[PDB]
A paper describes a structure:
Sirtuins constitute a conserved family of nicotinamide adenine dinucleotide (NAD+)-dependent lysine deacylases with seven members known as SIRT1–7 in mammals. [name], a member of the sirtuin family of NAD+-dependent protein deacylase, is critical for DLBCL growth and survival. [name] deacetylates a broad variety of [name] proteins involved in cellular metabolism.
Among many of the inhibitors we tried, we were able to obtain the X-ray crystal structures of [name] in complex with [name]-10, which has high aqueous solubility and facilitated the crystallization process. The complex appears to crystallize as a weakly associating dimer, and the unit cell parameters are unique among the human [name] structures. The inhibitor resides at the interface of the two chains related by noncrystallographic symmetry and forms several favorable contacts with the opposite chain, which complicates the design somewhat. [name]-10 formed a covalent adduct with the cosubstrate NAD+ as expected. P297 of [name] interacts with the benzene ring of [name]-10. The second [name]-unique residue, E325, likely interacts with the positively charged triethylammonium at the C-terminus of [name]-10. The corresponding residues are Q267 in SIRT2 and R446 in SIRT1. This structure revealed two small molecule–protein interactions that may contribute to its better potency: the Cbz group packs against P297 of [name], and the positively charged triethylammonium may interact with the negatively charged E325 of [name].
Author numbering: 122 to 391
């Protein structure tokens, strides 16, 4: 039914003023960060040199309590690298600057949405952040940088007060989501457009948010594959721009005529 041009004209005519966006690791592979479940290139295919029964265990809370050393060993791999936002992040920052963004729900823990200049009030970091850390024992909070040096020196970071293992405030498997996740009860009923970018929609409860929009709300998926409830519970106003998220976002900015605004933003940020 609807197409990528139809969605662009709804934004141009301001028929969609309250856009909600859900993103996953696919939007950060163009920034050099590997995703999780892409075959071959994903993290779950490149954990051979780790003491793991199965790859998902490294992000599971029970295994973390049993042995946190494999997690902090992997953390030392993407901690030192400096990563920059790409065209998808700046498209979402421009969506915000034009007053069209209701809320950006991200599963990513790379912090690139904040780097792109989207205020924290517009973000729901549903799987946490490395910007802060907490002792798993005494609950004391610490800035994320306080454990950086320990992770680099092949050490599991420990609480300076009680010696408990200190965890960055990311959400492992089996760990509750942060409080700000509950904002979906007010955001999704009011959304008039839903964008889903670069996620496999395999992790709950974040995945089920695609179903929380009203049935008349168009859902635009820019992803390599048709995934999640968009594949088994499709709706009349669903648009799928299948392929690279870079190419799909680039096509959308062109149809929106935001090319000149995008250049100004990129030149000011970078
Ligand atoms: C420098 C930083 C950069 C990053 C690297 C740093 C290294 C450290 C890693 C740490 C990360 C945190 C781990 C995490 N941890 C999520 C845990 C979930 C928590 C949830 N809490 C919960 O319920 O408490 C309830 C509770 C209530 C009361 C008390 C206590 C608890 C939970 O436990 N639920 C399960 C529920 N159970 C089973 C149902 C289990 C308990 C209940 C029985 O998060 C992640 C992640 O965020 C999550 C979602 O993944 P994604 O979708 O973002 O990415 P991926 O899969 O790779 O796909 C990507 C798609 O894009 C496509 N693509 C790709 N490239 C392109 C391209 N160029 N162009 C186009 N397309 C492209 C590709 O083709 C795919 O299509 O998966 C994993 S684990
Ligand atoms: Zn402690």
């Amino acid at each position: 039914k609807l197409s990528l041009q139809d969605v662009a004209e709804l934004i141009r005519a301001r028929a969609c003023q309250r856009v909600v966006v859900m993103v996953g690791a696919g939007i950060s592979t163009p920034s050099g960060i590997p995703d999780f479940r892409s075959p071959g290139s994903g993290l779950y295919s490149n954990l051979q040199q780790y003491d793991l029964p199965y790859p998902e265990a490294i992000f599971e809370l029970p295994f973390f309590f049993h042995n946190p050393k494999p997690f902090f060993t992997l953390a030392k791999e993407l901690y030192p690298g400096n990563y920059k936002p790409n065209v998808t992040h700046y498209f979402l920052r421009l969506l915000h600057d034009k007053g069209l963004l209701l809320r950006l729900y991200t599963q990513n823990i790379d912090g690139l949405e904040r780097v792109s200049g989207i205020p924290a009030s517009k973000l729901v970091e549903a799987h946490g952040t490395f910007a802060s850390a907490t002792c798993t024992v005494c609950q004391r909070p610490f800035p994320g940088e306080d454990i950086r040096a320990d992770v680099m020196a092949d050490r599991v970071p420990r609480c300076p007060v009680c010696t408990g293992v200190v965890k960055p405030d990311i959400v492992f498997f089996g760990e509750p989501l942060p409080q700000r996740f509950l904002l979906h009860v007010v955001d999704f009923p009011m959304a008039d457009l839903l964008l889903i970018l670069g996620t496999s929609l395999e992790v709950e409860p974040f995945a089920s948010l695609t179903e929380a929009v009203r049935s008349s709300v168009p859902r635009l998926l820019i992803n390599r594959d048709l995934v999640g409830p968009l594949a088994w519970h499709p709706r009349s106003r669903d648009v799928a721009q299948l392929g690279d998220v870079v190419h799909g976002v680039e096509s959308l900015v062109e149809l929106l005529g935001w090319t000149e605004e995008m250049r100004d933003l990129v030149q000011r940020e970078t």
